[PDB]
Amino acid sequence: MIVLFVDFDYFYAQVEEVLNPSLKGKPVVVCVFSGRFEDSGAVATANYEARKFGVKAGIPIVEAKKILPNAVYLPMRKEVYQQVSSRIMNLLREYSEKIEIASIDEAYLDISDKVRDYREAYNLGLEIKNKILEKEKITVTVGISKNKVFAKIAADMAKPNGIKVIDDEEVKRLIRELDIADVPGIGNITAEKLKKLGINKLVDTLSIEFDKLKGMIGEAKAKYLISLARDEYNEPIRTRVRKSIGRIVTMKRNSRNLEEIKPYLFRAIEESYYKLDKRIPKAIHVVAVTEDLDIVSRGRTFPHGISKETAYSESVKLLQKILEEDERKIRRIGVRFSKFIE
DNA sequence: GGCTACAGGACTC
DNA sequence: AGGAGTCCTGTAGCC
Ligand SMILES: Nc1ccn([C@@H]2C[C@@H](O)[C@H](COP(=O)(O)OP(=O)(O)O)O2)c(=O)n1
Ligand SMILES: [Ca+2]
Ligand SMILES: [Ca+2]
């Protein structure tokens, strides 16, 4: 298998750039304003000008404002970004039919059937960039290798506005010299559990006993890392089918009062049903973030599709069950729908 | 022992 | 300290 991965660079910021090029060269911070008070919320993304000075995704807008007060701060406009993304994804469809759209700004192409060797792939990646640069004036980063993981790793090493192939020898060099924390799916909690155990690099998972590693990180993550380390990871590029849709909103004040949480719950439901479109869910989950930022949720599956009016009703009962079974105040509340009708 | 549904955890961002 | 979505795991109810 040969896999080409494309990752759009600083995507939300770059779209804002394209809709207003006067922004180009200045630091740009796309934000999610929670609506508690002036500048409550977080940075969803920043362009590389802003990232130099430390303003990056996840930090609070307040923290960012300290560092770059003259930077342009823009509210997230996801609908816009999604339409730019859908257009870019169809351009990619012209270069392969086996396409896996992984997020709003990431896609894998199986380019076995389209390419013979890696240097031919690298020219294919130059074509794809320039097409996207011409058509949408969006820079992207391309990663090419033997599988999805190492193509993503390639693009991680090359962004922004980069191209890179990791050949079959490079893969073997990475197996034993890549900080295992740079492997997709290995976050901070799992990184630690690997150190607190011995494993700093992928090759190390072959020397530890399986049950010991399985004990720490779980069967699936152990099987995954092992398969990567043996160079036997080969998972297919397959079309991703959306499995759930939902909305969570931040309330202006924390609360355990049913009657003042309800309006936010109901808006989240109205917004979620719009977004559902023609999809009919058989399952609903109410999700709350407590004041100490812990996530609590209750859900029910139905032997039939959930009408909006049933959503309204079941959601209050599920919310009541949260209030009853968990004693902490609620800060954020929404819903999530799943198990769609086929 | 092994299957299915839930509620939480971890990760991608 | 926002918002969205996925896969995985421990537990319980049931063959
Ligand atoms: N915590 C984060 C991280 C990234 N993002 C958004 C969501 C995702 O679609 C987009 C991708 O990130 P971006 O292109 O800015 O940079 P990178 O590719 O993530 O380095 O940023 C977010 O909303 N929240
Ligand atoms: Ca990305
Ligand atoms: Ca990106």
Side-chain angles (χ1 to χ4, degrees):
Chain A
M1 183 169 54
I2 288 102
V3 172
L4 193 148
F5 171 73
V6 2
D7 188 329
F8 315 159
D9 294 332
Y10 61 101
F11 182 55
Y12 302 167
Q14 200 180 190
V15 176
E16 288 297 343
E17 227 138 276
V18 165
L19 297 195
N20 187 191
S22 84
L23 273 35
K24 183 59 164 178
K26 304 154 70 153
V28 176
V29 195
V30 182
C31 300
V32 200
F33 296 100
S34 66
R36 303 270 268 196
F37 53 95
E38 284 214 42
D39 310 331
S40 75
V43 174
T45 175
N47 71 0
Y48 278 81
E49 274 296 300
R51 293 194 194 173
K52 290 194 288 197
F53 303 95
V55 29
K56 66 164 175 199
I59 75 167
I61 299 161
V62 171
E63 233 224 317
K65 289 266 193 168
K66 291 181 170 214
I67 300 161
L68 301 179
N70 295 9
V72 194
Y73 294 83
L74 303 169
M76 255 224 317
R77 294 190 296 164
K78 189 83 154 291
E79 299 255 299
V80 184
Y81 315 146
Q82 180 68 70
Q83 266 288 96
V84 178
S85 164
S86 297
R87 293 210 299 276
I88 293 166
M89 292 308 173
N90 292 324
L91 297 171
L92 294 176
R93 287 171 206 278
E94 298 179 36
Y95 299 85
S96 171
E97 281 177 41
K98 290 179 207 185
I99 190 160
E100 184 160 336
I101 294 167
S103 69
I104 193 169
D105 83 324
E106 294 171 282
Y108 300 90
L109 302 192
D110 200 329
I111 56 156
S112 314
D113 296 3
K114 226 91 176 169
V115 154
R116 198 251 275 179
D117 54 51
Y118 283 141
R119 200 263 317 179
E120 193 150 298
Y122 182 90
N123 294 326
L124 222 213
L126 264 43
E127 283 175 26
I128 289 158
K129 282 164 142 279
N130 298 340
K131 183 86 148 197
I132 293 163
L133 216 188
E134 176 182 47
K135 253 265 163 72
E136 304 291 357
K137 315 227 79 179
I138 290 293
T139 197
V140 316
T141 289
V142 161
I144 299 157
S145 174
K146 57 148 53 215
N147 68 31
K148 282 198 284 177
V149 174
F150 281 107
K152 184 154 185 46
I153 287 164
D156 284 343
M157 286 173 175
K159 59 171 61 179
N161 197 349
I163 347 88
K164 169 161 183 68
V165 37
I166 295 182
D167 64 60
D168 288 25
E169 173 59 58
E170 255 270 68
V171 167
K172 281 285 159 175
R173 203 190 53 69
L174 269 21
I175 296 313
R176 62 191 131 78
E177 289 169 14
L178 187 68
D179 188 338
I180 199 168
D182 298 327
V183 180
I186 303 300
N188 316 29
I189 290 195
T190 308
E192 274 300 312
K193 292 152 73 190
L194 299 164
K195 274 143 195 144
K196 195 176 172 73
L197 188 66
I199 294 91
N200 274 126
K201 316 200 161 280
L202 227 18
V203 74
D204 300 310
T205 56
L206 308 173
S207 307
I208 188 169
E209 298 175 14
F210 173 73
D211 292 345
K212 198 152 144 65
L213 180 63
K214 168 178 175 182
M216 255 299 189
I217 63 171
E219 191 171 42
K221 234 127 182 164
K223 274 193 63 158
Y224 169 70
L225 291 170
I226 289 182
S227 89
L228 283 161
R230 291 168 165 170
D231 200 356
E232 298 182 355
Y233 176 96
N234 217 32
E235 244 57 19
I237 275 71
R238 81 198 318 173
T239 71
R240 288 198 201 190
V241 285
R242 187 83 104 203
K243 261 163 182 163
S244 85
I245 282 162
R247 224 298 216 197
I248 270 234
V249 301
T250 295
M251 303 186 291
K252 293 221 169 187
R253 339 165 225 169
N254 303 347
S255 162
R256 319 191 77 261
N257 188 292
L258 187 58
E259 229 55 41
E260 68 184 48
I261 297 160
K262 270 180 164 189
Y264 296 94
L265 187 63
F266 293 169
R267 177 148 68 79
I269 285 166
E270 290 295 338
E271 287 172 27
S272 294
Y273 263 74
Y274 174 75
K275 297 207 304 201
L276 232 28
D277 199 321
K278 281 196 158 69
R279 289 169 286 201
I280 308 306
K282 287 156 64 258
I284 167 161
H285 278 75
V286 171
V287 182
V289 181
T290 59
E291 64 180 329
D292 46 87
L293 273 58
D294 206 357
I295 282 61
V296 176
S297 85
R298 298 294 190 275
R300 181 174 183 190
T301 298
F302 288 89
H304 55 73
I306 298 167
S307 71
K308 206 202 290 156
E309 294 81 4
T310 300
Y312 265 74
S313 172
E314 191 60 31
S315 75
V316 170
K317 296 181 194 184
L318 293 173
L319 172 53
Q320 284 208 119
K321 198 186 292 170
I322 293 168
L323 279 336
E324 174 184 333
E325 297 177 357
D326 191 284
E327 275 72 350
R328 312 199 293 288
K329 277 181 184 282
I330 295 167
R331 172 179 188 111
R332 282 134 72 168
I333 191 73
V335 291
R336 178 152 293 278
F337 294 92
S338 81
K339 307 195 204 183
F340 303 132
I341 293 293
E342 268 143 355

